[PDB]
Enzyme design. Structure first.
Site, PDB file in Angstrom:
ATOM      1  NE  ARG D  60      -3.696   0.676   2.322  1.00 43.47           N
ATOM      2  CZ  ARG D  60      -3.333   1.655   3.152  1.00 43.47           C
ATOM      3  NH1 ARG D  60      -2.329   1.515   4.011  1.00 43.47           N
ATOM      4  NH2 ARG D  60      -3.976   2.811   3.107  1.00 43.47           N
ATOM      5  CG  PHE D  65      -1.401   8.633   4.863  1.00 36.61           C
ATOM      6  CD1 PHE D  65      -1.833   9.503   5.850  1.00 36.61           C
ATOM      7  CD2 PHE D  65      -1.857   7.325   4.890  1.00 36.61           C
ATOM      8  CE1 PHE D  65      -2.688   9.068   6.850  1.00 36.61           C
ATOM      9  CE2 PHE D  65      -2.713   6.893   5.890  1.00 36.61           C
ATOM     10  CZ  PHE D  65      -3.127   7.765   6.868  1.00 36.61           C
ATOM     11  CD  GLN D  68      -0.175  -1.756   5.688  1.00 38.79           C
ATOM     12  OE1 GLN D  68      -1.204  -1.293   5.197  1.00 38.79           O
ATOM     13  NE2 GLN D  68      -0.121  -2.967   6.226  1.00 38.79           N
ATOM     14  CG  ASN D 107      -1.654  -2.401  15.735  1.00 43.07           C
ATOM     15  OD1 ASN D 107      -1.780  -1.406  15.024  1.00 43.07           O
ATOM     16  ND2 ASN D 107      -1.445  -2.326  17.043  1.00 43.07           N
ATOM     17  CG  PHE D 118       2.685   2.183   8.770  1.00 42.71           C
ATOM     18  CD1 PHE D 118       2.827   3.385   9.425  1.00 42.71           C
ATOM     19  CD2 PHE D 118       2.003   1.165   9.397  1.00 42.71           C
ATOM     20  CE1 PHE D 118       2.288   3.572  10.669  1.00 42.71           C
ATOM     21  CE2 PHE D 118       1.474   1.342  10.651  1.00 42.71           C
ATOM     22  CZ  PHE D 118       1.620   2.547  11.290  1.00 42.71           C
ATOM     23  CG  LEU D 127      -1.309   6.792  13.093  1.00 40.33           C
ATOM     24  CD1 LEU D 127      -1.024   8.114  12.401  1.00 40.33           C
ATOM     25  CD2 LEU D 127      -0.889   5.619  12.227  1.00 40.33           C
ATOM     26  CG  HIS D 131      -1.164   1.695  14.466  1.00 44.19           C
ATOM     27  ND1 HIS D 131      -1.632   0.558  13.845  1.00 44.19           N
ATOM     28  CD2 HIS D 131      -2.104   2.648  14.265  1.00 44.19           C
ATOM     29  CE1 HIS D 131      -2.802   0.814  13.288  1.00 44.19           C
ATOM     30  NE2 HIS D 131      -3.112   2.075  13.528  1.00 44.19           N
TER      31      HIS D 131
END
Ligand SMILES: CCCCCCCCCCCCCCCC(=O)OC[C@H](COP(=O)(O)OC[C@@H](O)CO)OC(=O)CCCCCCCCCCCCCCC
Lengths: 145, 145, 36, 173, 486, 497
Positions: D60, D65, D68, D107, D118, D127, D131
Site C-alpha cells: 500500500r 501519508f 505500508q 496492527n 509502514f 497514531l 500502533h
C-alpha cells in the site's frame, strides 16, 4: 467475537464524536465536495469497521474495491444509513468525503451475534461498532429505486 | 576463478603504474580484447619493432575510401605496441625508463591524433599526421634496433 | 564406424525417441481421454 | 530519535525488474524501549528464520501519508505472522511519531501486531497509542519519496511492484 | 419509466412481431423477404446500439438491466454473430425442406436472450435470459427432424443444459440467501457483509455451483461432454450460431457475475477458473487431434479457444483489462463463423461432414480451400492473422498480470492446436485420385442458385480473420474503453 | 529518408499476391514472373547495400519505425547491423537461386513459387527487424510457408517431417515469445520493444539468466543444439532441393544470428555465464554430428547432420567472447549457407537423376554424371574446411578466437581445440565416404543402357554461382569479415566492461 480476518491496516484520524439524537456517535472528518449522498442510489464507499476496543474485522481495502451499497432503502445497517444520509437533520456525505461513525448496538446488529457460521461469530452481541467511511463516488449509473 | 573459464567481468589487462596514458582518460586506440603473448623482455623489444614496422609499412593502405581499414590496423598494432611498451617500461632498467615512457607518450598522442583523423574519414589530415608519426615509427624502430 | 553406428543409434532411437514420444504420448492420451 | 540501537537495512526495487536495487532504506531501531517489536523486525530479516521480508512488497502506498509493507506469506496485507508464533501484543508507547521517516508497526487494532509496518512521510502524530511506534530512517528518505510519488490504483496499491530485494543485519550492533 | 437504453433489444422484439405477421396473412408466399426483414432488424438493432454508444452506463429498469460499455460491446458482438450467421442458413433450410419461418424466430430470440444476458443485472435475468438462450438453443438444435440421432442428441442437450442452469441457479439461490434477501449483483456483495456471510461456507457453495454452471454453459473441459454429442447431430449453421453466441454471452456473464458480486473471494474463484482454463486449454486441444469428425473437433477447438479466453477473464480490469478478452471474442467470431461457413459449403455441395472427405478440395475449389485454410491458420495462428494476435494480446495481459502457468500452457496447447489445423490443411491441399472420396469427386459448385450470400459472409469472415490481426490498434483502442465493468 | 527495408521485405509477398488466379495454367509464366521478382528484390537489396549502407559505422542503418499496435509498443522497426547485412544478402542470393533451382517444378507451381516468395519476405523480415515482437512475427511467418513447400513438395515421409518441423519450431517459438514477453514487460520502467533502445539495460542476473534460457531454447532448434536437433535430419533429408537449400542455406542461420542479436548484445552478462557450457555443447556437437553422418545410409540426411556439425563452429564462435570468434561465426553462417545450399541442391539433383537414396546402393555414378561429380567434390572440399574455400577460414578463425580467448584458460583451451579438431578428421571420413560410395566405382549393370543426363546448364550455373563466393572468400575473406567486424566490436565492448 473472534474471526477478525486479520488485516493489519494503518489506522485513521481520531476525532471526537458529535453524537446524534438517535444514539449514533457521529463524527465528520473531511467534508466532501460534490453532490449529496442521494437517498436510494448505489453509492461506492470505502470503509474500515472496528469493534469497541478498536480491532478491525472488515474493510473494503481488504478486498481492494469500493463497496457498492444502496443507501436509504434499508439494504444496510441503520447506523450506516443514518451516518451517511442523516435522518434527524444530520448532514449527509458528499462525494470524495470521509467520516467516522461509532455505531451503537441499538442501530448496529442488536444484542444478536450477527453472522455465526461455525461455533464462533463474526460479530458479538452489543458490539458498538466503529466505522471509518470514505465515500469515494456515486455509482456512475444508478437509479433511485 | 574456477580454474577453467573465469567468469563475470572479463577484465582488461592492467596498466602498471605508468604515465603512458593520456591523463584525460586512459587511451582511445585500445582494442578491448587482444591476446598479447607474454614472451619476455627481448621478445617484447622485438615485437615493438615488428608492430612499428607494420604501422610504418601501412603507407600503401592509406587512400580515399580506405580509412576504415587504416583505423582498424592502427588501433590493433597500436594496442600491441601499448601493452608491449607497458611491459617494457615496467621491466626497464630505471635509467632508460623515463625517456622510454616519454617516447611512448609522444608516440601515442600521435597515434591518437591519427585515429581521430582516420575514424572521421579525414584523409589529408590523416596523411599530414602520418608524416610525423612515420618519423616517430622510424625513431622507435632505430631505438629497439 | 562402430562409434558412428552407436551415435546414430543414440540419435535416432533415444534422443529422437523423446521427440517422437512427445507425439506418441499426445496421440495416446488423446485416444484414451476420447474413449474414457 | 531516542537511542538508535540497531541499524538495519532493506533495499528495494521499484519498477518492472526485481533486482534493480533502487537505493536502500537504512533504518535505526530503538531496541531498548521496545524489545519485542525490534527483535521481531530483526528476525524478519530472514537471519535465523525461513520466513522474512526478503521478497515481500510494499503493498500500500498513499501520497502525503504512509507507505505500508511487510507481508511475506501474502501480498495484500493478510499474512504477516511475526516470529512469536503468529501475532503478538503492543509494548510501551513511550515515544511518538516524530514525523517523516518512522517505522510504526501495523496492527488491526489493540494488541494484534504482526510483521507489517509502514514508513511515515508526513507528520502523522495522531497514531500514538494505537500502533506501536519505533524505528527511524537515517539514509534514503528520497527513496521513500520515490515510493510515495508512484501512481497508485483503485486498491491503493503501487502500480509498479515495490519489492524488497534483501534484508540483513548491519554491523552496527 | 422510459427505459430507452434497451431500444437496441426492443427493436428485435418489435421486428419479431412483424415476423409473426408474415406468418399470419399468407403463410407460404414469403421466402426471401422474411429473411430480409430479419436481417434488417439485426442491422437496425446494430445501428441503434452504435447510436447509443456515448451514453453513460445508466441502469434503466428497476434494478434489472445495466447498459454498460462492456455489455454494450458484448451485445454488439452477439448481434455481429447473428448478422454474420443469418446468411449461413438461407440454403440449409431449403436443403432440408424445413421452415424458414420460426427458424428466424428462434435465431432472433436467441440473439435477444444473449443481448439481455449481457446487460442483465438481476439474478432473475441472469436466469431468464440464459434460459431464453438455452430454450431457443434446444429448439434450434432439434430442427432438422430427419432422423433419431439428432433427436436423442438434442434431448440430452436439453437435459444437461437444464441441469447446468439448475446448478447455476442453485448457486444464485445461495447468493440470494446468504446475501440476506438481496439480488441485483451490485447490492449482492453489500448483502454478503450486511449479514456478515462473506466469510461463510454458504457463499463458497454459491461460488462453486455458479462456476460449475458457467463452465457447463462455457463447455470448459470438466463440464464439456455435451458439445461433442450435440454439435455432431445438430445442423451445422445453428452449431455455429449457438457455439459462438452462447460462448460470448456466457463470457459476458462470467465477467458480470464474477467481478461485480464475487470479488471479495476473488482469490479462490480465480483458482477455480484457472483449473478449468488449464483443463479447457489442454484436453480440448488434446482431443481434436484424434477426431475423425469435423463439427466435433471444431467444438473441441472452440473449447480450447474459450480456455484461452478465461485467461482474459481471470485478469482484472487494471493489470491488463478485459480488452484482450473482448478482441479475442471478436476474432473468435470472425474466424470461427468463417470456418463454419466453409464447413457449410462443404456439406451443401458434397453432403457429408466427415473429415476424410475434405481431401482434394484444392483441385475442385481453390477459393473455398484457400478460405478454409486461411480460417484454420487464423484459429491456430502461425502468421500475422487474427487469432494469432488475439492470443498474443491474451498472453500479454496474462504475463503482465503474472499468470505464467496459464500463458505457458496456452502456448503449448496453441502448438497442439496448430497440429490438427494443419492436419485439416493437409487434406484440402493434397490429392491422389483415390485418397479423395466419391463425395469429393462430385463437388458441383456450378449447379447452384447463384453466387450466394453464404459466400459473402464467408469472405467477410476470411477478411476479418486475416486483416484485423494486422488492423488491431483500432480494435484494441475501442476495447480499452470498457473500464466501467468494475 | 526512404522506406528501404520495408520495400525489401514486403515486396516478394506484395508481388506474389499478384498471382491471385492469373489464368496461365503452365509453370512457365509464374516461374519466370517469380524469378524476375526475386532478381528485382535481390537488386533492390544490393542497391541498399552498395550505395546506401555505410560499412564502417557499426550502428543501425536504413532505420525505419512505424506504429502498428500501441498496446504492445509494437512498431515496424527495421534496421541493418554489420552482422545482419551479410545474412540479408545471403537470403537474397540463396532464395533467388532456390527459386532458380525450382524451375522444373510443375505440380502446383503457382503456389510453390508464391510460398517461396513468402519465405523470401519472411527471412529478410526476421533479419532486418530491430523490434523483438516483429522478430517473432517474421520468425513464425517462415513457418507455415516452409511447411507448405515441405509437405506437398519433396520427400517420401514428407508429412511426418513437416509436422515434426512445424511443431518443434512452434514449440520453440513459444519459448521465444516467453523471452520477448519477459524482456518487454519485466525489462524496465517504460516497457518497450525496440532493440536499439533495449541493448543498454540492466537485466539483473537472476532475470537475465531466465531470459537467456527462454531465448536459448528458441534458438537452440533453429541453429540446432544437440539436445534439440532431431527436426533437421527428418526435415532437410525429406525435402525438395530448392526448399532444402534455404532450409540449410538461410533458415538455419537465424538462431545462429539470433544468438548474436538477442543473446550476445542484449543479455551479455548472462551470456558470460552460459557461453562456457555452449562451448562444450558445440565441441560435442561437431563430433556428434560428424559421427552420426557415417551412420546415415541416406545421402540427404548425411548433409543434414553435416549442417548440424558445421553449426557447432558457429555455436563456438558465439560462445567465444572474442572478435575473432564471433567474426568466424558470422563468416561460417555465410560460408555454410553457400555450402549446405549447394550441397543439398546437388544431392537433390543426384536423386532426381539416379532415383536412389541410400549409399549402400548407388555405387559408381561418376561416369554417368561427371559434372555433378566434380561440383559435389568441390563443395565437399568446401564443407571440409579446405583452404581456397570459405569453410577453411571460418573453421580456422573460430579456432583462433578460441586460442586468443580471454574468457577461457589453457587447461580448457587445449581440450576444446582438441575436440574441435577431431571434427576435421571425422569430416573427411563422412564426406569422402559419401563421395566414394555414390561416385567412385563401377556397376556392371550400368554400362550404356541407362546413359543418364548430365548436369544441365541451369544446375551447373546454380552450383558454380554458389561456388564462386566460396572461392572468393577463401582467397580473400574480407568480403565477409569487413561488413561485420566493426559491429562485432560494438558487441564485445559490452563484454569486457
Ligand atoms: C505438441 C505435441 C505433438 C502433437 C502432434 C504430434 O504427435 O506430431 C505428429 C507427428 C506425426 O503426425 P502426422 O499425422 O504428421 O504423421 C505423418 C503422417 O502425415 C504420414 O506419415 O509426430 C511427429 O512428427 C512428432 C512431433 C514431435 C513434436 C515435438
Amino acid at each position: 467475537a473472534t474471526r477478525i480476518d486479520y488485516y493489519a491496516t494503518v489506522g485513521d484520524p481520531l476525532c471526537e464524536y458529535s453524537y446524534a439524537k438517535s444514539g449514533l456517535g457521529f463524527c465528520d472528518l473531511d467534508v466532501g465536495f460534490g453532490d449529496e449522498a442521494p437517498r436510494g442510489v448505489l453509492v461506492n464507499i470505502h470503509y474500515t469497521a472496528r469493534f469497541a476496543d478498536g480491532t478491525l474485522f472488515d474493510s473494503s481495502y481488504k478486498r481492494a474495491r469500493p463497496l457498492t451499497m444502496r443507501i436509504g432503502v434499508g439494504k444496510v445497517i441503520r447506523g450506516l444509513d443514518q451516518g451517511i444520509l442523516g435522518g434527524e437533520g444530520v448532514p449527509p456525505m458528499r462525494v470524495g468525503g470521509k467520516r467516522k461513525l461509532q455505531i451503537p448496538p441499538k442501530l448496529a446488529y442488536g444484542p444478536e451475534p450477527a453472522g455465526c457460521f461455525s461455533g464462533d461469530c463474526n460479530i458479538p452481541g452489543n458490539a458498538t461498532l466503529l466505522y471509518d467511511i470514505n465515500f469515494v463516488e456515486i455509482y456512475p449509473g444508478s437509479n433511485t429505486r | 576463478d574456477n580454474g577453467f573459464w573465469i567468469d563475470g567481468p572479463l577484465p582488461i589487462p592492467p596498466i602498471y603504474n605508468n604515465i603512458v596514458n593520456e591523463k584525460t582518460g586512459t587511451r582511445t586506440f585500445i582494442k578491448k580484447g587482444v591476446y598479447v603473448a607474454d614472451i619476455g623482455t627481448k621478445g617484447r623489444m622485438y615485437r615493438v619493432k615488428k608492430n612499428a614496422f607494420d604501422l610504418l609499412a601501412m603507407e600503401d593502405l592509406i587512400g580515399p575510401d580506405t580509412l576504415n581499414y587504416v583505423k582498424k590496423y592502427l588501433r590493433l598494432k597500436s594496442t600491441f605496441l601499448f601493452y608491449d611498451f607497458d611491459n617494457l617500461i615496467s621491466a626497464a632498467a630505471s635509467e632508460d625508463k623515463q625517456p622510454l615512457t616519454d617516447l611512448a607518450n609522444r608516440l601515442f598522442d600521435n597515434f591518437e591524433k591519427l585515429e581521430d583523423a582516420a575514424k572521421t574519414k579525414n584523409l589529408a589530415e590523416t596523411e599530414s599526421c602520418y608524416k610525423d608519426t612515420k618519423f616517430l615509427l622510424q625513431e622507435v624502430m632505430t631505438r629497439m634496433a | 564406424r562402430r562409434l558412428a553406428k552407436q551415435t546414430t543409434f543414440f540419435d535416432k532411437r533415444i534422443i529422437d525417441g523423446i521427440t517422437n514420444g512427445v507425439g506418441i504420448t499426445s496421440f495416446f492420451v488423446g485416444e484414451v481421454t476420447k474413449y474414457i | 530519535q531516542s537511542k538508535i540501537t540497531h541499524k538495519v537495512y532493506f533495499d528495494i526495487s521499484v519498477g518492472n525488474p526485481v533486482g534493480k536495487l533502487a537505493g536502500r532504506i537504512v533504518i535505526g531501531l530503538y531496541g531498548d524501549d521496545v524489545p519485542q517489536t525490534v527483535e521481531n523486525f530483526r528476525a524478519l530479516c530472514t537471519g535465523e528464520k525461513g520466513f522474512g521480508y526478503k521478497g515481500s512488497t510494499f503493498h500500500r502506498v498513499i501520497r502525503d501519508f504512509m507507505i505500508q509493507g511487510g507481508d511475506f506469506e501474502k501480498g495484500n496485507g493478510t499474512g504477516g505472522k511475526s516470529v512469536y508464533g503468529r501475532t503478538f501484543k503492543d509494548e510501551n508507547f513511550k515515544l511518538s511519531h516524530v514525523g517523516p521517516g518512522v517505522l510504526s508497526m501495523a496492527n488491526a487494532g489493540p494488541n494484534t501486531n504482526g510483521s507489517q509496518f509502514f514508513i511515515c512521510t508526513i507528520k502523522t502524530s495522531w497514531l500514538d497509542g494505537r500502533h506501536v511506534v519505533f524505528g527511524q530512517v537515517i539514509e534514503g528518505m528520497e527513496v521513500v519519496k520515490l515510493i510515495e510519488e508512484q501512481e497508485t490504483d483503485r486498491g491503493d496499491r503501487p502500480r509498479k511492484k515495490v519489492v524488497i530485494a534483501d534484508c540483513g543485519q548491519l554491523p552496527m550492533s | 419509466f422510459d427505459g430507452s437504453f434497451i431500444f437496441p433489444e426492443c427493436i428485435l422484439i418489435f421486428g419479431l412481431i412483424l415476423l409473426l405477421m408474415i406468418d399470419s396473412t399468407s403463410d407460404q408466399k414469403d421466402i426471401p423477404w422474411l429473411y430480409f426483414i430479419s436481417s434488417t432488424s439485426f442491422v437496425m438493432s446494430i445501428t441503434a446500439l452504435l447510436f447509443r454508444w456515448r451514453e453513460e452506463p445508466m441502469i434503466s429498469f428497476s434494478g434489472n438491466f445495466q447498459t454498460n460499455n462492456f455489455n454494450e460491446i458484448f451485445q454488439f458482438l452477439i448481434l455481429l454473430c447473428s448478422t454474420l450467421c443469418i446468411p449461413l442458413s438461407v440454403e440449409y433450410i431449403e436443403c432440408t425442406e424445413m421452415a424458414i419461418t420460426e427458424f428466424l424466430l428462434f435465431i432472433l430470440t436467441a440473439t435477444l436472450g444473449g443481448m439481455f444476458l449481457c446487460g442483465a443485472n438481476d439474478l432473475i435475468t441472469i436466469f431468464v435470459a440464459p434460459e431464453c438462450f438455452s430454450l431457443c438453443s434446444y429448439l434450434l438444435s432439434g430442427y432438422t427432424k430427419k432422423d433419431i440421432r439428432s433427436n436423442e442428441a438434442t434431448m440430452k442437450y436439453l437435459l444437461m443444459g437444464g441441469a447446468s442452469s439448475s446448478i447455476l441457479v442453485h448457486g444464485f439461490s445461495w447468493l440470494y440467501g446468504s446475501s440476506g434477501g438481496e439480488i441485483e449483483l451490485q447490492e449482492i456483495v453489500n448483502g454478503l457483509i450486511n449479514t456478515q456471510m462473506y466469510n461463510s461456507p454458504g457463499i463458497s457453495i454459491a461460488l462453486i455451483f455458479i462456476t460449475v454452471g458457467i463452465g457447463f454453459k462455457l463447455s470448459l473441459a470438466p463440464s464439456h461432454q455435451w458439445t461433442p454429442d450435440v454439435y455432431e447431430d445438430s445442423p451445422t449453421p445453428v452449431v455455429a450460431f449457438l457455439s459462438v453466441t452462447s460462448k460470448v454471452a456466457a463470457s459476458a456473464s462470467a465477467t458480470r457475475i464474477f467481478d461485480i458480486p464475487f470479488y471479495f473471494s476473488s482469490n479462490e474463484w480465480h483458482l477455480l477458473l484457472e483449473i478449468l482454463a488449464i483443463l479447457s486449454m489442454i484436453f480440448g486441444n488434446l482431443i481434436a487431434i484424434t477426431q475423425t469428425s469435423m463439427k466435433r473437433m471444431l467444438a473441441y477447438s472452440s473449447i480450447g479457444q474459450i480456455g484461452y479466453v478465461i485467461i482474459g477473464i481471470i485478469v482484472g480490469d487494471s493489470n491488463g483489462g478485459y480488452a484482450s478478452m473482448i478482441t479475442y471474442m471478436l476474432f473468435y467470431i470472425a474466424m470461427n463463423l468463417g470456418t463454419f461457413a466453409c464447413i457449410i459449403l462443404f456439406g451443401l455441395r458434397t453432403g457429408t461432414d466427415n473429415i476424410r472427405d475434405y481431401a482434394g478440395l484444392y483441385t475442385k475449389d481453390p477459393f473455398l480451400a484457400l478460405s478454409l485454410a486461411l480460417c484454420l491458420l487464423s484459429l491456430g495462428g502461425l502468421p500475422p492473422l487474427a487469432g494469432f494476435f488475439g492470443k498474443l494480446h491474451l498472453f500479454w495481459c496474462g504475463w503482465q498480470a503474472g499468470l505464467y502457468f496459464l500463458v505457458s500452457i496456452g502456448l503449448l496447447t496453441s502448438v497442439l492446436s496448430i497440429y490438427y489445423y494443419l492436419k485439416i490443411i493437409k487434406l484440402l491441399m493434397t490429392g491422389r485420385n483415390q485418397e479423395i472420396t466419391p463425395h469429393m469427386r462430385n463437388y458441383r459448385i456450378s449447379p447452384l442458385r447463384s453466387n450466394n450470400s453464404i459466400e459473402l459472409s464467408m469472405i467477410v469472415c476470411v477478411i476479418a480473420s486475416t486483416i484485423p490481426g494486422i488492423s488491431m490498434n483500432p480494435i484494441i483502442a475501442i476495447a480499452q474503453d470498457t473500464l466501467f465493468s468494475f | 529518408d526512404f522506406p528501404w527495408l520495408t520495400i525489401i521485405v514486403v515486396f516478394p509477398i506484395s508481388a506474389g499476391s499478384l498471382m491471385l488466379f492469373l489464368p496461365h495454367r503452365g509453370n512457365k509464366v509464374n516461374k519466370w514472373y517469380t524469378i524476375c521478382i526475386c532478381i528485382l528484390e535481390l537488386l533492390l537489396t544490393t542497391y541498399a547495400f552498395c550505395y546506401n549502407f555505410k560499412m564502417d559505422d557499426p550502428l543501425i542503418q536504413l532505420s525505419e519505425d512505424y506504429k502498428w499496435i500501441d498496446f504492445f509498443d509494437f512498431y515496424w522497426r527495421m534496421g541493418i547491423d554489420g552482422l545482419s547485412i551479410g545474412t540479408i544478402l545471403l537470403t537474397g542470393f540463396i532464395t533467388t537461386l532456390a527459386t532458380l533451382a525450382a524451375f522444373p517444378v510443375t505440380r502446383d507451381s503457382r503456389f510453390f513459387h508464391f510460398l517461396m516468395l513468402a519465405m523470401y519476405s519472411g527471412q529478410i523480415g526476421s533479419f532486418s527487424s530491430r523490434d523483438l515482437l516483429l522478430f517473432f512475427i517474421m520468425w513464425e511467418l517462415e513457418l507455415i510457408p516452409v511447411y507448405l513447400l515441405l509437405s506437398m513438395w519433396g520427400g517420401k515421409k514428407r508429412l511426418y517431417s513437416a509436422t515434426k518441423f512445424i511443431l518443434y519450431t512452434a514449440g520453440s517459438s513459444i519459448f521465444l515469445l516467453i523471452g520477448v514477453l519477459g524482456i518487454s514487460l519485466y525489462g524496465s520502467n517504460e516497457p518497450t520493444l525496440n532493440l536499439e533502445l533495449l541493448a543498454n539495460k540492466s537485466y539483473p542476473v537472476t532475470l537475465e539468466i531466465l531470459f537467456y534460457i527462454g531465448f536459448l531454447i528458441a534458438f537452440a532448434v533453429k541453429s540446432p543444439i544437440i539436445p534439440l536437433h532431431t527436426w533437421l535430419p527428418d526435415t532437410h533429408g525429406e525435402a525438395h532441393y530448392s526448399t532444402c537449400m534455404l532450409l540449410a542455406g538461410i533458415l538455419l542461420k537465424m538462431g545462429a544470428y539470433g544468438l548474436v542479436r538477442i543473446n550476445m548484445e542484449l543479455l551479455p552478462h548472462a551470456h558470460s555465464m552460459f557461453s562456457p557450457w555452449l562451448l562444450v555443447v558445440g565441441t560435442i556437437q561437431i563430433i556428434y554430428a560428424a559421427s552420426t553422418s557415417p551412420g546415415q545410409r541416406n545421402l540427404k540426411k548425411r548433409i543434414a547432420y553435416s549442417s548440424v556439425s558445421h553449426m557447432g563452429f558457429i555455436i563456438i564462435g558465439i560462445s567465444s567472447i572474442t572478435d575473432p570468434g564471433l567474426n568466424g561465426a558470422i563468416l561460417q553462417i555465410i560460408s555454410h549457407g553457400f555450402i549446405g545450399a549447394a550441397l543439398f541442391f546437388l544431392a537433390g539433383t543426384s536423386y532426381d537423376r539416379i532415383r536412389l537414396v541410400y549409399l549402400d546402393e548407388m555405387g559408381g555414378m561418376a561416369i554417368s554424371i561427371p559434372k555433378i561429380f566434380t561440383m559435389f567434390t568441390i563443395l565437399s572440399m568446401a564443407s571440409l574446411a579446405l583452404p581456397g574455400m570459405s569453410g577453411f577460414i571460418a573453421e580456422f578463425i573460430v579456432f583462433f578466437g578460441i586460442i586468443t580467448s580471454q574468457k577461457y584458460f589453457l587447461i580448457s583451451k587445449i581440450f576444446i581445440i582438441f575436440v574441435m579438431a577431431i571434427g576435421m578428421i571425422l569430416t573427411p571420413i563422412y564426406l569422402l565416404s559419401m563421395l566414394r560410395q555414390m561416385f567412385y566405382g563401377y556397376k556392371l549393370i550400368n554400362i550404356k543402357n541407362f546413359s543418364f543426363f548430365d548436369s544441365g546448364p541451369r544446375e551447373l550455373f546454380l552450383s558454380i554461382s554458389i561456388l564462386l563466393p566460396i572461392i572468393g572468400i577463401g582467397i580473400y575473406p574480407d568480403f565477409v569479415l569487413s561488413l561485420a567486424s566493426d559491429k562485432v566490436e560494438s558487441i564485445l565492448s559490452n563484454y569486457f566492461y
